[PDB]
Amino acid sequence: MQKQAELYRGKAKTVYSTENPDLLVLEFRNDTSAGDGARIEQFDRKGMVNNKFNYFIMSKLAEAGIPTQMERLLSDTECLVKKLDMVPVECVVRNRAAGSLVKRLGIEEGIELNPPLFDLFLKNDAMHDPMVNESYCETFGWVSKENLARMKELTYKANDVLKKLFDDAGLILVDFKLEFGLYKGEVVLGDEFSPDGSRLWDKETLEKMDKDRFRQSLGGLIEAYEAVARRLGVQLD
Amino acid sequence: MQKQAELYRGKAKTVYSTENPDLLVLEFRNDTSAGDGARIEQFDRKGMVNNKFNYFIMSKLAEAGIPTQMERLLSDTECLVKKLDMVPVECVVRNRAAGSLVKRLGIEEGIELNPPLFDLFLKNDAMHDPMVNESYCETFGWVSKENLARMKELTYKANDVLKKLFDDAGLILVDFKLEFGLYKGEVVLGDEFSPDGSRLWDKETLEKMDKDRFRQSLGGLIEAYEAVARRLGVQLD
Ligand SMILES: Nc1ncnc2c1ncn2[C@@H]1O[C@H](COP(=O)(O)OP(=O)(O)O)[C@@H](O)[C@H]1O
Ligand SMILES: Nc1ncnc2c1ncn2[C@@H]1O[C@H](COP(=O)(O)OP(=O)(O)O)[C@@H](O)[C@H]1O
Ligand SMILES: [Mg+2]
Ligand SMILES: [Mg+2]
Secondary structure, eight states, X not given: XXXXXXXXXXXXXEEEOOSSTTEEEEEEOSEXXXXXTTOOEEOTTHHHHHHHHHHHHHHHHHHTTOOBSEEEEOSSSEEEEXXXXXXXXXXXXXXXXXXXXXXXXXXXXXXXXXXXXXEEXXXXXXXXXXXXXXXXXXXXXXXXXXXXXXXXXXXXXXXXXXXXXXXXXTEEEEEEEEEEEEETTEEEEESOOSTTSEEEEETTTOOBOSTXXXXXXXXXXXXXXXXXXXXXXXXXX | OOOOEEEEEOSSEEEEEOSSTTEEEEEEOXXXXXXXXXXXXXXXXXXXXXXXXXXXXXXXXXXXXOOBOEEEEOSSSEEEEEOOEEOSEEEEEEEEOOHHHHHHHOOOTTOEEEEEEEEEEEOXXXXXXXXXXXXXXXXXXXXXXXHHHHHHHHHHHHHHHHHHHHHHTTEEEEEEEEEEEEETTEEEEESOOSTTSEEXXXXXTOOBXXXXXXXXXXXXXXXXXXXXXXXXXXXXX
């Protein structure tokens, strides 16, 4: 299985078709966007780190029983995945207050959330990914009630699994975003899990080591990404 | 019954205590606030119209079986109500796209929503009443799952009842906002139902006859409120 032609691309990955109608090639680019204003910069090794970081996390979730898109890595920046009919809704679980929650509610960053919060955002850059809820999914036909329930279920399961994984690595899983899609009628985890869409703080110093370093221009973005990879045991070289 | 002391006030009503610890007096002022930028304006007869308008609707909802705060009207602008431990979350049902939905999702105003949408907003002027969801209610303890389910159940019932009532009066109930509180542990409809928090369009011309006339500089606010009141059978003078 090799890339055939580019079908489409997003702000971080390029999607290619393959000879198989049910398999695609995801290419992680070095592109790094930010804010609703959207400012993009390229960071060396970024795509490769996220691709391998994603494979590692996806496998951990699969081992836990989470059905995923993953087939296998193809190169430093590419992987083979099942073609999914993506539900255009981001699922965000928050263990501590940060990002848009802090901006939206004016709550103090870092506040522990018990139980964790669960946000749903419609994927629409034009509208800056507006917040939605279950009624919207039904009314606009984005996903069935049964499938949405499954998505939330798998997200919370992923949260339980990953909070433990990151804790063992001396990290706090502040929050993260997931995207699911349908594969032959079944809900499957797709897209990616990396520091781009998940917040990770050092357990002892609370130092931010995810995309917030880029959003807040704190410097050392990729250095932080690789630091996290090393703590988890993700081979990069 | 008589007002004993002003407890507090919001942007449209003043809340007073009475000699009875379980009863309050609500005064509907002529104060009208549009745009969180609090561009207040006073409209003569506004308080009186909404007080009578609210009484009429609450009475209809009560007949339908919905528990409400209403005891009786004390004057043209005041009403005697049960003291409720208000849940700080607005419940909004949308039958057609309008207001913030249009600006939020970029959907065309007027589009019919099937099934209707249901929004939850945290009451917080400083933060412009940010949108929330059920997980927020549990995490921050604004209201239990059981009571929230009850609030939504009653809001949907109010929708079935009021859509018919307004249609009979040649009007389209576009959307509306309700607020509930607890009375000795039970969920009870409180606050108010008026053109201030509900969108109503003439069934034949679609002319707006609610607070949107003030929000969107169309003028004729009170004249519209009175026209709606009279169509419902409310005698204003
Ligand atoms: N397994 C998959 N099958 C099909 N599409 C997928 C799969 N995994 C991810 N996608 C989609 O491919 C795109 C990946 O690109 P990305 O640059 O992250 O986009 P975005 O700008 O929306 O963040 C997204 O639209 C995502 O939903
Ligand atoms: N029956 C009631 N018991 C107690 N508080 C009530 C009752 N009905 C309404 N309230 C509260 O009193 C206030 C009425 O004020 P209003 O001017 O509409 O406020 P706001 O500026 O928040 O819209 C609101 O905070 C409302 O929740
Ligand atoms: Mg993406
Ligand atoms: Mg109010």
